[PDB]
Amino acid sequence: AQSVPYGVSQIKAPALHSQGYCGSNVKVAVIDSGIDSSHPDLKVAGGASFVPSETNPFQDNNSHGTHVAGTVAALNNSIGVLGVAPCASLYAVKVLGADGSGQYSWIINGIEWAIANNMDVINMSLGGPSGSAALKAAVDKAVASGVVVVAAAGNEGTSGSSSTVGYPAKYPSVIAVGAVDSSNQRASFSSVGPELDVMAPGVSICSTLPGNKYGAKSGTSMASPHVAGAAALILSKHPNWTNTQVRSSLENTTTKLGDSFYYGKGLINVQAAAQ
Template sequence: MKKIMVILSALVLLLMPLQTGFAEEVKLEAKSDYLVKFNGPADQGLLNAFGVEDHDVNHTFEKLPVVALSLTEGQAKGLLNHPQIEAVEQDAEVQAFAQTTPWGISHVQGTEAQDAGHTGNGVKVAVLDTGIDCSHEDLNVSGGHSVFTDSANNDPCNDGNGHGTHVAGTVAALDNNVGVLGVAPQTDLYAVKVLSNDGSGSYSGIAEGIEWSIQNDMDVINMSLGGSQSSSILEDYTNLAYEEGLLVVAAAGNDGNRGGNNDTVGYPAKYESAMAVAAVDENNQRATFSSTGPAVEISAPGVNILSSVPGNNYDSYNGTSMASPHVAGVAAQVWAAKPDLTNVELRNLLNDTAQPLGDSNKYGSGLVQSLDAINQ
């Protein structure tokens, strides 16, 4: 008999550590937060049957039979399979939506001007480009025109290239907690499609776009485009826009060399009635591609510029095409703040308040500065 008792005692001793270890494993099983919805009144007894204790109940809702619980994975699976339970969902984490302020916007004092209440409200900016994706979540396009008649290009809201949508975002991407922020987010944007979806166009098309802008009372024209050959008719239209009171802003071109010692500014930027915009990087150094020459009038960010592209997307581009809309956006901010200025006075003010950067053939008057212009 003693022998049997000894054996039984040994068995009990062997079993005890195993039982203790199993209990500890249950206690240590990770729990996550869940939302559980009953298909009738919430039943605390049912929860208790699955081992849910009072301290596991994070919140009991009143309007719907929903309880916020801390559950193990096994408890969650068990509840999900019960006929009295309609849904078991992991309590997902949420974050505040955020938008990115591209470096160029603050670099031209765009954000400082916005903080002071200057958002370009009421100023009309015509973007003569590949069109604008009018359905983009970050853009508010007020209207537009296409110079093309073919089905692929006759809609100014169809930007099959992306260039125009990117330019538009720099001018006026909305302050809406998504995507990016533009220089003048309350500016009235107009899509004037003078370049096809493959990015090409003609001087006659640009002239037509300028004419439309004059006829439709635009305030600022942005032309992030150009060619190497002059045209007296294109010059006449550029001059006419300026004479009619519009501010004409154009990309200087991307034909510069590392030394920056050539006269490579393209047209229409090279015409006296247009502001030719050169590109600089975050260190205010001229981008090596930025065209140079006596026609360069002012500078703006044009390297690694993040902005909107079609399909509610965003991308970074380089070019004086990216610099020009910074100036157009600043012009909108300043003109909205100082509506009594003529276009000539506005142009002079932007040049007078630009931050000097050096050689005028490379930088013109320097880096455009919005708040300084507004405060002068």
């Protein structure tokens, strides 16, 4: 039997699925630890590895990339779970090793690859406390080229009155995603600041794991792919919308929560965003 993870329903994805909108022909790049292409509930279309010691993008020695990928696009069938955009074309852009860390050079290499390969949506469930001109240039180039760039906000919680949003989420060109639970309450770990854009489910998220498994994980890493998948749904309904239009629609139709420093614009609603 297939289960629908709470988070998928919470952002109102199933409403679109019912209409026949599931992200078909939308190219989504998961820039992370790779995706287990052998998982029966996923379909990987392609990708690349930029980790020097782990040349196969289709082997996830961490489990993080695979989990993120399932939130985006676990297949609509009779097993496992269901992704926000189950018909999307999924790409494994491996920039993180087995330990879940990776060099900036590798990440930037992955964004450059995504732009050159005409990805529609980029998901980056990763972050560092420091930026670089090259990192900023790459995300800006992607947006300038019409790509929707989504990133996790960070898991740093609160710190007095300062922003704890990480990079590249901190850049204006990137959509920065914080995490809520099933009751719409902000997760205590979710990073905060004026650079936070939207919220999505991020606590105890069930998704795919390598080796034909499924398990829950919590983090802004789990929130981001709900927004990435939401963008893919929008593009499947309005293929001529620009990245700017997708972004504005997502931000403009949220369910408002508390203060924007903690919740950004609020919780995404893909049904409202899709018009």
